[PDB]
Design a protein around this ligand. Structure first.
Ligand code: 888
Length: 563
């Protein structure tokens, strides 16, 4: 079965597309090597089409069926509810793509009669029709990256496939509660989206320590979405159906599976038929849950086929990392080969071949790695970090261009304890916010696929709640981390850390001068910049924050708003 079939109609833009890094008066203070930063556009959609287009074959053995039966057994304990039209509407992002039927995201959120009436008609159609393929729009994503080295210089735009707004609201009603609760029940501690950064680090560290002679590896599946077959998607449906559901929800899920999830026609922004899809749609509510369940199912069975010892997996959609009991460096390499052969038979061939790791800090999963620093008391502290190249390239772009998603904010929140997020991102962006008097302006960012509207002034409390106060006093980072950051800066032409420490003292002083929440930011976020630090005590508002739903499930491409 081919993942896609094309007509020849091009994947078209729905607006003007920029590829070169936009420059303004603030750009050079952050990055000088402008030519190293770019954004993907529809101009490379052709290259992407070739990569994601291929034949899929599956050979399912008993290990596969054994694991699936166990997953279904846990899924049977789940009771999920249907969401009312209003609840589904409120989960819709204010700037979600408008419907082709006379209404947009705001009309949905406002529960306008027109939107609500059309939504009900789509719902009724799903119940009456369980066969007609539902239309979807295919677009080229505009994402920012840094060039080099030998991966062709620049990577092609990724593709996004999504159904109409009316259908998206319907998915929420029938499956929001399911995709939010089922994964954790089925996979337990292996479900990665239930963890905050600190909790993820804790699980990785404790899992690593639970093995006599730990060995670990990340498994990179080549174009995971395209490796997902009709079988996989139907098996996913069988798992959802194991839940205790309202009869109406069962019909809608069966309908969505047959008409949308398994595949359907692809239409470009101009209304032309681009082809047909027979693999995972990247822009549906079940994309994250489906990829997670399927990755976990195939990997769990593969672990058995490979006979890995005391296996512990951590799955986030298509991102997989396994930690197990080492049986010698020789058998470890052989085991991974068997694991890989098993995954392949299941249709999930690897991109980069997997390799055994015997140093937890060298394993990258979800683009991150565990590292260590020290708190005020001098105690060793494990935290999550990553190479800052992409985060910095995106920050440069957002420095001169307002975007729907502010990656710099998401990165500060998730990587608040890191050297680079603290010295560069915080310093740079708070400087910009100060100068524009926009510290109180709520900005959107995405965490685990979901959209959140966050006020920068609330960062101190948010960071305390997610990482603890230690995020404001970590010091003495590892040489490896320091060197990776410093190297990254030289590559992009970003001023050295010493410059940022100097700038931070200024930003800090400026914030303190504003008093109120602004002062709190200067105090907590930049205490690392002064030689004579302070005490930094718990923030009252911190415990007042409603951080519910922040780290429960993944919703990548799920069109979810959690504010
Ligand atoms: C594992 C995290 C603690 C650290 C890395 N990290 C992520 O993995 C993700 C993330 N969200 S997602 O649903 O698209 C997704 C889908 C499938 C596999 C991984 C992710 N990963 C972030 O959206 C993110 C945003 C800001 C900063 C860091 C971040």
């Amino acid at each position: 079965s081919m993942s896609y079939t094309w007509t020849g109609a091009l994947i078209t833009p729905c607006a003007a597309e920029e590829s070169k890094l936009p420059i303004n008066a603030l750009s050079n203070s952050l990055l000088r090597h402008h030519n190293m930063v770019y954004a993907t556009t529809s101009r490379s959609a052709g290259l992407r089409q070739k990569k994601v287009t291929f034949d899929r074959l599956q050979v399912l053995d008993d290990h596969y069926r054994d694991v699936l039966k166990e997953m279904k057994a846990k899924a049977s304990t789940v009771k999920a509810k249907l969401l009312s039209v209003e609840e589904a509407c409120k989960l819709t992002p204010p700037h979600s793509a408008k419907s082709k039927f006379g209404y947009g995201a705001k009309d949905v959120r406002n529960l306008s009669s027109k939107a609500v009436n059309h939504i009900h008609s789509v719902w009724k159609d799903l119940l009456e029709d369980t066969v007609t393929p539902i239309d979807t729009t295919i677009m080229a994503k505009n994402e920012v990256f840094c060039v080099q080295p030998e991966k062709g210089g620049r990577k092609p735009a990724r593709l996004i496939v999504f159904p109409d707004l009316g259908v998206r609201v319907c998915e929420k009603m029938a499956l929001y509660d399911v995709v939010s609760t089922l994964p954790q029940v089925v996979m337990g501690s292996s479900y990665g989206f239930q963890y905050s950064p600190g909790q993820r680090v804790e699980f990785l560290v404790n899992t690593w320590k639970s093995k006599k002679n730990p060995m670990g590896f990340s498994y990179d599946t080549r174009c995971f979405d395209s490796t997902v077959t009709e079988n996989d998607i139907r098996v996913e449906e069988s798992i959802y159906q194991c839940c205790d559901l309202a009869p109406e929800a069962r019909q809608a899920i069966k309908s969505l599976t047959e008409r949308l999830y398994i595949g359907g026609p692809l239409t470009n922004s101009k209304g032309q038929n681009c082809g047909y899809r027979r693999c995972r749609a990247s822009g549906v509510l079940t994309t994250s849950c489906g990829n997670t369940l399927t990755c976990y199912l195939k990997a769990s069975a593969a672990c058995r086929a490979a006979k890995l010892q005391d296996c512990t997996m951590l799955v986030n959609g298509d991102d997989l990392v396994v930690i197990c009991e080492s049986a010698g460096v020789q058998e470890d390499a052989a085991s991974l080969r068997v694991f890989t052969e098993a995954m392949t038979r299941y249709s999930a061939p690897p991109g980069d071949p997997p390799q055994p790791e015997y140093d937890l800090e060298l394993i990258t999963s979800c683009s991150s790695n565990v590292s260590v620093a020290h708190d005020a008391s001098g105690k060793r502290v494990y935290y999550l970090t990553r190479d800052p190249t992409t985060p910095l390239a995106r920050a440069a772009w957002e420095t001169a261009r307002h975007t729907p998603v502010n990656s710099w904010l998401g990165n500060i929140i998730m990587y608040a304890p890191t050297l680079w997020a603290r010295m560069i991102l915080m310093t740079h962006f708070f400087s910009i916010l100060l100068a524009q008097e926009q510290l109180e302006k709520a900005l959107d960012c995405q965490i685990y696929g979901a959209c959140y509207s966050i006020e920068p002034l609330d960062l101190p409390q948010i960071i305390e709640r997610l990482h603890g106060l230690s995020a404001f006093s970590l010091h003495s980072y590892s040489p490896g981390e320091i060197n990776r950051v410093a190297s990254c800066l030289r590559k992009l032409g970003v001023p050295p850390l010493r410059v940022w420490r100097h700038r931070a003292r200024s930003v800090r002083a400026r914030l303190l001068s504003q008093g109120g929440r602004a002062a709190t930011c200067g105090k907590y976020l930049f205490n690392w910049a002064v030689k004579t630090k302070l005490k930094l005590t718990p923030i009252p508002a911190a415990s007042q924050l409603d951080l519910s739903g922040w780290f429960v499930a993944g919703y990548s491409g799920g069109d979810i708003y959690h504010s």
